[PDB]
Design a protein around this nucleic acid. Structure first.
Ligand code: K
Ligand code: K
Ligand code: K
Ligand code: K
Ligand code: MG
Ligand code: MG
Ligand code: MG
Ligand code: MG
Lengths: 172, 49, 209, 49, 163, 288
RNA sequence: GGAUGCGAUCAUACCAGCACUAACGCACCGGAUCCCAUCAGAACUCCGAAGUUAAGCGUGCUUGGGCGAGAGUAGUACUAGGAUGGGUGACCCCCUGGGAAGUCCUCGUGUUGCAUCCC
RNA sequence: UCAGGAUAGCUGGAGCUCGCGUGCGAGUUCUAUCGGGUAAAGCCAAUGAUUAGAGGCAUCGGGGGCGCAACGCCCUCGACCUAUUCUCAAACUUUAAAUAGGUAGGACGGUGCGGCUGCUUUGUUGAGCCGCACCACGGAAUCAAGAGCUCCAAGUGGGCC
RNA sequence: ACAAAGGGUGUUGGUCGAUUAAGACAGC
RNA sequence: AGCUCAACGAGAACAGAAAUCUCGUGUGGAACAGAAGGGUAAAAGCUCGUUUGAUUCUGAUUUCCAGUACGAAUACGAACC
């Protein structure tokens, strides 16, 4: 019973890149293509849930796209995103459930050549940190809660980010 | 209900009298018609006479 | 405009509260139920007097408002504006109907006319807590309020401390033993349950009273 | 001219004049409505009995 | 029909017990029903098929048929000046085995045993049970007596907990 | 602040599900539909072929339902297969087939129907159903997959094929056996036989040793330690089937239960001890 | 004394926070050629046995919440039957019977069927 | 169809089948078993309605003071959270009576063998039914001016207390 | 085949208080 | 067959009370055509695959009730799916 157990190592479970553009059409397709070329997998479109006149969206209009990346590709994407952010994250960017994320304004900073037709697209970076044994909550048979001592906390995620990436966390 | 119980006790006329063995069933039957009758514990002299 | 109160004195119908089925009901005449020094601490007003109803009947909201106004006015005039706390203990939740006089008794179900309170025998109507030096003033104020209600009422001097549920001797004993937490006008009694760490030093007790 | 709408007054007395009649239950009851397959098998068994 | 639907006035009758909704325990489907068995009709509000009419809810009858999923029940029903033996089919979820005759077989067996024993010893007995009768006399040991007197009246105690 | 969600009222209104549902082990809809018997069949029980796969074992048993609880007519474990010569791959398709065949043989021996119904000693990959005899009908059981996903080529269907070859009548179709093609609505008998004999494992072994010998070792350490090669798997499985058919009677453990059982878990504290600890804690708290 | 597979009852079994567990197990866990599956080998499916009891499962504690039982509330509220009973009435006493429910207090925190295995 | 009629119920007449306390019965109790949501009660339990204060909280409310501002500070009233609190429901409710409702208390019973089936079972495994043999003091109280069955038909279908 | 809320220093019983033979209340 | 809803808490550029996305809690406080009341959580709700038991034959029963009919519904039997 100690914190040095190899099973307590914190690893990046997945990285989700989300692009939320109000309109649907050519812009949505271009954003989906950007996500596909940046992640290497086919993205998934998200439909609007309600109708908001001010935003200009309608129910079931495909007003967003996103992709889920795991493994080495996710780590490389996270490293590039942090490089764009200069390894600078706010203390509020970390959630109480051992997760953190950030955003970028231009996808060109991630290594994509500018195309005037495509335009400029920002993105949302969210990283989910988990320890081995989280499967007990995702499996179908015998679904159970992960022990609160084994769950990744805000402090654990902040320390992991500080140690691995040598990052600096600001209060502001 | 009162009329039926009074027939079951064989009391069809005012001032008719009958003996009744004490029992939970009989006592509970008599409780329902209490307002229409009066009863007690007869004497040997009473029974004989 | 308003029918005499004798028309609705007796409780003859089932409760008819304002709800989604009964709409268009006028607001009650009484909206304030606590007057005087309602913010006074529980330990400042040990004396308590009750105007207790002795009849089963309906009491209109207008009568409650008038009784409250009269009692408050006399109490302020006699003992002062900060020497008492008056609490109306009855809320009018019954809607009274009127069949305004198409022709005859056809379709007679009336429209809401007003609101009243259904009062049982022995139900408290008014409560006043103050110091021992204003007991006679409180009794006379309740006596004046009596004339604003229908039926028969009785003034009863409570044995409880203020508006709490403890008798004066029991309240004093509990306070001496440090088992009372003042909560506005209410008083909380300390038991022997709950998380132990939640108790302050000296407030944890092995056994209840 | 309106009239009375409904009432059960006097109906229980009428019912009790000759009721409440309980039909006598015979030893063998009718088999109508029972599972046809079971009845078919029972008939065959009786035939070969 | 004729002013009242099939399930009219069943808000409470057909509702399920508090904190007893959801899946049905397997014991319901593992019961065995046979002709002549007495059963109690209790509508399960979650099973909408084979539902008896509300009248038969809370009534006890006898099994007269056995299908794959349902059981035939004969239930007495009073109509004016006679009793009608109405035959209905009800799914087993809505029916429970009745305990109205649980002690009959036991009592018959004990009566037979007692009669056989009496015959063996050449005696005549009655096995009928009897209602509770008067008890005989007995002696009660004297002890300390506590006197009870009427309570002096106090108006302040007329309210629960005091005024 | 934030309002508390798990309030007293929430718990007061809470209805707990069945224990086997809270643990996520029993699907009561499927269980009820599997066990419910026609009432005009009375006390006739419905036997079901229960197959469960743990991380390192296969459990197969024939069960019947009663009010007191399920009753096991026969059972067979993959951990018993080493007695028959199968020491590795106890959780693969071939192991499932062997377990099903063993359970079928055991239950038929229990019912004294082994001689009448023998099945096919050879595995074969074609769909098979034991032919009813004149003396009696074949023993019938219903497959109980559980919470697993019934995909094509699932190990549960390998166990079903093993049981069918054993000589048990299990209602089934051929749409989920290994080798069934989605594009063509046909069953490939060759592929089914290959999977029954573990030939997919042999192909994986050959590919790994050809490409990545170090990964081959890391992945088949136990196979190498037991001295089983890819080419020897089929003969080993044939020998295992022959041994299972020769003697399916379950062995009785010779171990003797200990006279006394040592307790390794804490016992519930008595009322007096709890009160003493509470008194100590209260005295410590007050004395501050 | 337990674990596992299948269960019965369906909270005395649930929820939250802490502590502990020999062996076999159950797990976490390593991969994606094959069957299978998705945006995602996360899940599902298949093939495995390098590592770990960190988590799950199990057990124990909390003047914990909930839940269950008792005491009390209280012969109170209510109620079947009676009166040429009181009262202007509202309502209520009495006679022959039945008889609840919050608050407060005390206790308890699962019991079990078949099969395999460890001790 | 609404001052009417038919229809069922209530009634008469005619009987018939049996019976004499061993009673196929009962507007009654007893015993054992079931169902209920009214009275009451509850909100310190869900839904809805409703009074008052007490203790804390905000880069995100209206104000006062110290201030050019400040994610600067101190207080007032509001929201918010916590533990309390007055008063409520025909179309609310955890709980939940009294009265009343249903079922059963043998001769149409039980036990042991044998037999029939085209139904059912892996299985003369069950499910019904049928024969043989034995036992069965009448299987709670009270009452029973008796029980059952059928035919023809009158009047009534304004009620009222 | 009616009577209410409010009242009475009419009279008749009860309940809780205050003063009094170190002398109660009214007049000298 | 798979999944779990409303709502809330904490996070992520534009993005804010309200767009999409991540985790946690979540006894149904959502949804189930319509009035209301019941009922439903590995479902009766949402998504997807395959389909036409919204099929053929007459009988029985329940509700209404005179124990008539119609409407509606339920449980078997005999076929084809
Ligand atoms: K008055
Ligand atoms: K209650
Ligand atoms: K409430
Ligand atoms: K007529
Ligand atoms: Mg552990
Ligand atoms: Mg507790
Ligand atoms: Mg009634
Ligand atoms: Mg489904």
């Amino acid at each position: 019973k100690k914190l040095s157990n190899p099973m307590r190592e914190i690893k990046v479970q997945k990285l989700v890149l989300n692009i939320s553009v109000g309109e649907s059409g050519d812009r949505l397709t271009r954003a989906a293509k950007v996500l596909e070329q940046l992640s290497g997998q086919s993205p998934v479109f998200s439909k609007a849930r309600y109708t908001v006149r001010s935003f200009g969206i309608r129910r079931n209009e495909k007003i967003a796209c996103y992709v889920t990346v795991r493994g080495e590709k996710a780590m490389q994407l996270l490293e590039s995103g942090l490089k764009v952010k200069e390894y600078e994250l706010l203390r509020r960017n970390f959630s109480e459930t051992g997760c953190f994320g950030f955003g970028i304004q231009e996808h060109i900073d991630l290594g994509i050549k500018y195309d005037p037709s495509t335009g400029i697209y920002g993105m949302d970076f969210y990283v989910v940190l988990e320890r081995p044994g989280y499967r007990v909550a995702r499996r179908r048979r015998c679904k159970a809660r992960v022990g609160i001592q084994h769950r990744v906390t805000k402090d654990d995620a902040m320390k992991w980010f500080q140690v691995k990436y040598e990052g600096v966390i600001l209060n502001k | 209900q009162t009329k039926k119980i009074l027939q079951l006790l064989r009391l069809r006329q005012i001032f008719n009298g009958v003996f009744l063995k004490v029992n939970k069933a009989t006592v509970n039957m008599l409780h329902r018609v209490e307002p229409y009758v009066t009863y007690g514990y007869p004497n040997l002299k009473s029974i004989r006479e | 405009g308003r029918r005499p109160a004798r028309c609705y004195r007796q409780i003859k119908n089932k409760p008819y509260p304002k709800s989604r089925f009964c709409r268009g009901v006028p607001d009650p005449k009484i909206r304030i139920y606590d007057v005087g020094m309602k913010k006074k601490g529980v330990d400042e007003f040990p004396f308590c007097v009750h105007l207790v109803s002795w009849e089963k009947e309906n009491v209109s909201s207008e009568a409650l408002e008038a009784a409250r106004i009269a009692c408050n006015k006399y109490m302020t005039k006699s003992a002062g504006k900060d020497a008492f706390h008056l609490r109306v203990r009855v809320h009018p939740f019954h809607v009274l109907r009127i069949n305004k006089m198409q022709t005859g008794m056809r379709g007679a179900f009336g429209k809401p006319q007003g609101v009243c309170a259904r009062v049982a025998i022995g139900q408290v109507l008014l409560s006043v807590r103050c110091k021992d030096g204003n007991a006679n003033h409180a009794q006379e104020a309740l006596r004046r309020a009596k004339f604003k209600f229908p039926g028969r009422q009785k003034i009863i001097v409570s044995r409880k401390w203020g508006f709490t549920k403890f008798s004066r001797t029991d309240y004093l004993k509990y306070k001496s033993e440090n088992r009372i937490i003042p909560d506005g006008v209410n008083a909380k009694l300390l038991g022997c349950h709950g998380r132990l760490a939640a108790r302050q030093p000296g407030r944890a007790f092995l056994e209840a009273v | 001219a309106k009239s009375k709408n409904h009432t059960a007054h006097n109906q229980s007395y009428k019912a009790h004049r000759n009721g409440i009649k309980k039909p006598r239950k015979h030893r063998h009851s009718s088999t109508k409505g029972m599972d046809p397959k079971f009845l078919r098998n029972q008939r065959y068994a009786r035939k070969h009995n | 029909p004729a002013g009242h639907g099939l399930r009219s006035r069943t808000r409470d009758s057909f509702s399920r017990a508090f904190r007893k909704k959801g899946t049905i325990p397997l014991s319901t489907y593992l019961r065995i029903f046979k002709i002549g068995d007495y059963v109690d009709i209790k509508v399960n509000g979650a099973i909408h098929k084979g539902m008896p009419h509300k009248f038969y809810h809370g009534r006890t009858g006898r099994v007269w048929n056995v299908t794959k999923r349902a059981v035939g029940v004969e239930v007495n029903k009073q109509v004016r000046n006679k009793i009608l033996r109405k035959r209905i089919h009800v799914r087993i979820e809505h029916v429970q085995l009745s305990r109205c005759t649980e002690e009959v077989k036991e009592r018959m067996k004990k009566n037979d045993q007692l009669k056989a024993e009496a015959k063996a010893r050449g005696e005549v007995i009655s096995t009928k049970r009897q209602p509770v009768g008067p008890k005989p006399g007995f002696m009660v040991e004297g002890a300390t007596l506590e006197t009870v007197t009427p309570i002096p009246y106090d108006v302040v105690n007329d309210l629960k907990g005091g005024y | 602040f934030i309002k508390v969600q798990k309030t007293r009222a929430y718990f007061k209104r809470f209805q707990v599900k069945f224990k086997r549902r809270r643990e996520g082990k029993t699907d009561y809809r499927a269980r009820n539909r599997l066990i419910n018997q026609d009432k005009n069949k009375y006390n006739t029980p419905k036997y079901r072929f229960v197959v469960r796969f743990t991380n390192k074992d296969i459990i197969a048993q024939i069960v019947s339902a009663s009010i007191a609880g399920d009753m096991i007519l026969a059972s067979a474990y993959a951990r018993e297969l080493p007695q028959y010569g199968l020491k590795v791959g106890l959780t693969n398709y071939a192991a499932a087939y062997c377990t099903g065949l063993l359970l079928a043989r055991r239950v038929l021996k229990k019912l004294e129907m082994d001689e009448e119904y023998q099945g096919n000693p050879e595995a074969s990959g074609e769909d098979y159903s034991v032919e009813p005899a004149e003396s009696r009908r074949p023993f019938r059981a219903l497959l109980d997959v559980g919470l697993i996903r019934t995909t094509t080529g699932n190990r549960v269907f390998g166990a079903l094929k093993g049981a069918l070859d054993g000589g048990l009548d299990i209602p089934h179709s051929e749409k989920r056996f290994a080798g069934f093609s989605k594009d063509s609505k046909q069953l490939d008998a060759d592929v089914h036989r290959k999977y029954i004999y573990g030939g997919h494992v042999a192909t994986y072994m050959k590919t790994l040793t050809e490409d990545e010998p170090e990964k081959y070792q890391s992945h088949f350490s136990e196979y190498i330690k037991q001295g089983l090669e890819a080419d020897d798997l089929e003969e080993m499985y044939k020998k295992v089937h022959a041994a299972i058919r020769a003697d399916p009677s379950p062995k009785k453990s010779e171990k003797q239960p200990p006279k006394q059982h040592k307790r390794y878990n804490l016992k519930k504290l008595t009322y007096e001890e709890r009160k003493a600890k509470l008194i100590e804690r209260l005295n410590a708290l007050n004395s501050a």
